[model samples]
Target: RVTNQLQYLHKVVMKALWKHQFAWPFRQPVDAVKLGLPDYHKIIKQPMDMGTIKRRLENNYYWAASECMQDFNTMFTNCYIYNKPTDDIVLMAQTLEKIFLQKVASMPQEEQEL
Candidate 1:
């Protein structure tokens, strides 16, 4: 019963993320060589993306919904770490963060506990 509520919240965020205009870059893994950032892996230790989050959500791979929430935070953090302030991707990450946080807060209650 608790999980059903959590699952619905997760799906809502996933769907919103998938349709976001700037979500293209985070939908899959980044190719360092393709982007000419050979040091990407070294820079982003715990690499994360929306697609990876999607699979994790579907596979019931998380112990708490908080883990999933933090994963998205990590994904955005990794983007900022790897990209320059002037880069477009960094801005997109900000956008995702804004929408996602608000949407999660939109859940209307913050008293969830395990």
Candidate 2:
């Protein structure tokens, strides 16, 4: 149940990112409904600043990624359960690197890209 919540939270964050859907004076309940984030308001309240909202979403994303990494590592180590472990790792790294580059490119010119 908790895992599903975390997963949904990550999806909500990612959807906002790709869609540029974040609103000023962020309203959790309204945004939750708009994002299809059912029961999300139970975890977060309204009237949150962008900083707090970013932190909450980023924390959820990091937690989900951390859990997924552990499972993937176990599968990679086991080898027999999954094939092409090396390729999977390489693809994951490349995908993350691409995302990092895109994020860096979107930042202000004054800010450090890396």
Candidate 3:
């Protein structure tokens, strides 16, 4: 059951990142401005909704998981060394978890009681 929950959350993270196109090797920050989205800082920090999470889980959870693990590994690989500045890569990974957890934490206590 715990793994199921973790898997669900993983799916949520993968879906959100994939849907928002937070690809690895990191995109140029200026691209967000070009797309008329919120600033990269703000956009990455936003939360996901239950509907969005549910839909993403439904559409293709396995595919999302594949993409998420690949991107995460890439980002982590680039940041593992000392004195290196893989800020964007690290931050992109952080943003994924940050937003996902924020959304989950915002749920009612009763709902989160599981």
Candidate 4:
């Protein structure tokens, strides 16, 4: 019923993110030490990424679709915080957010009912 539909929708969203061009930076957990962002761990107390979200979704860990969005928000917010305004990654985050919103908006009306 509603669970199946929402899970399918979540799957669709996750797949879209995985296929997106901006998916690289967020594909997995950030390697702070490797990336030379020594302060990343300090600045981002709660780290989130596409792979982590994907794992959670696959495990049926989220009770609501919005929870996935919240994780996405955290991922993007972390990017903005760690990078400067002129950083290209920040722009990617913005574009990726638009794609996500559009995908959610396109869901069938009936399937969208809570």
> Candidate 3 residues 73-98, lDDT tens each?
44434333311366554665566546
Taking all chains together, each candidate's TM-score versus the true structure is 0.87, 0.24, 0.31, 0.85
State the lDDT of candidate 1 residue by residue for 35-84, as single tens digits: 89889999899999889988887777876667788888999999888888
1 or 4: which has the higher TM-score?
A: 1
Model 2, CA-based lDDT: 0.38
lDDT value, residue 50 of candidate 2 = 29
List of clashing residue pairs for candidate 1: none
- C-alpha local distance difference test of each model: 0.81, 0.38, 0.43, 0.81
The window of 10 residues in a row where model 4 has the poorest summed lDDT is: 1-10
Per-model RMSD to reference: 2.5, 15.2, 11.5, 2.8
Candidate 4 structure quality by residue, lDDT tens digits, 18-63 = 8888798898999998898888899999999999988887777777
Ranking the candidates on lDDT from highest down gives: 1, 4, 3, 2
TM-score leaderboard ranking: 1, 4, 3, 2
Poorest 10 consecutive residues by lDDT, candidate 3: 105-114
What local lDDT score does residue 58 receive in model 4, on the 0 to 100 scale? 74
User: Which pairs, if any, clash in model 3?
Assistant: none
